[PDB]
């Protein structure tokens, strides 16, 4: 009756930034989602393809739990089909999505009065992301005759801009920790239940 680690991915200290989202492959559960339904402060308990009230009783094989930190405005982009900056260059979901999306309001925990410049986000790519793919390419997009040899300048742009994350920006601009559960049922006897 070993409980599977939602505690390692929900009340953690350091969520990674959105351009490199850490992904935990959860397996061999007896997954008790009733600890989520007693935790009050969730901004959005949205599920696409599955119902929230029948979530405890159905079985899966592997459940993936991603995690990142985005603006509170950009949560309206962690969704099947929506385009923007987070779902076009950082983290995109497929249109047959069968998981849930949970969001926080961590302005108390992820903000100093100075700029909390740890969290980064991607600005552009040469093509939009295939779904469920991370991109840690850290070099300057040249697109010119000039080899600028790794220092930023004219016609040489770094791809990762940084947030500020002060506690006085805005209720839609203070950082929202977002955890994306994505279930699956591929052709195997089920382990995740209970």
């Amino acid at each position, epitope marked *: 009756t070993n409980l599977c680690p939602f505690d390692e991915v929900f009340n953690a200290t350091r969520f990674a930034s959105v351009y490199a989202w850490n992904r935990k492959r959860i397996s061999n559960c007896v997954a008790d989602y009733s600890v989520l339904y007693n935790l009050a402060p969730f901004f959005a308990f949205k599920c696409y393809g599955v119902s929230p009230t029948k979530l405890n009783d159905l079985c899966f094989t592997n459940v993936y739990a991603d995690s990142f930190v985005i603006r509170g405005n950009e949560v309206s982009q962690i969704a099947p089909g929506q385009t923007g900056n987070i779902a076009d260059y950082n983290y995109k979901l497929p249109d047959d999505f069968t998981g849930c999306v949970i969001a926080w309001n961590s302005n108390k925990l992820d903000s100093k009065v100075g700029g909390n410049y740890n969290y980064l986000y991607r600005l*552009f790519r040469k093509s939009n992301l295939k779904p469920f793919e991370r991109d840690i390419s850290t070099e300057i997009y040249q*697109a*010119g*005759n*000039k080899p*600028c040899n790794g*220092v*930023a*300048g*004219f*016609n040489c*742009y770094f791809p990762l801009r940084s947030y500020g994350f002060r506690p006085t920006y805005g209720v839609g601009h203070q950082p929202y920790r977002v955890v994306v559960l994505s279930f699956e049922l591929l052709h195997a006897p089920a382990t995740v239940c209970g």
Partner: antibody
Amino acid sequence: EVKLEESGGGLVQPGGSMKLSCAASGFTFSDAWMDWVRQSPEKGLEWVAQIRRKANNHATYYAESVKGRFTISRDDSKSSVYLQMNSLRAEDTGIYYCIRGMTYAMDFWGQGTSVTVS
Amino acid sequence: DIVMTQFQKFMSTSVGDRVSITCKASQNVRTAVAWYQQKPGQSPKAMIYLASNRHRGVPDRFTGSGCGTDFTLTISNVQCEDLADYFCLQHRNYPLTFGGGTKLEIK
């Protein structure tokens, strides 16, 4: 709010020299490629010069129409851009704009200078 | 070296239609072409950087893309204030070429 204001407007006979300056405010000065373009009514717009960032060792280049006779200089402590031009000809008449940074975000422009020739 | 010929010296369309300015270049300029819009009696402003993206403060009507040699900018539901010049320049090799200008005026 960022704006660039500029001065140094006048007329002199060809063979003269003028060092016009463009001051700025409201933004981080040492991280910018402040270029100059020129608007004349006869040829559209022309590109004058470019001074790069402090990290690129002030890599300063000009157009091939103004070889040698045009040179630019900045001083980020006083936060202004000095452009001096040498031994001029007659068809360089027009409005010379002042630019924060070209062909990217934060692409703010000034208002130009009225400089003319006889 | 690089020459850009903007072969529409005057394009005139009424209110509510679609206007497309055409700007093709000299040789293989991949993505490094911007667009600048100048109101009469004012300094020019930024419209599109790197031939795809939108600069801050532009309306939703203004987009135009393409790569290679042929670039364009498409305006839909042209307003009364949207009479302006339209310049296209390149920054691939170091001389930058402001091509030809395009003046709009309502009939």
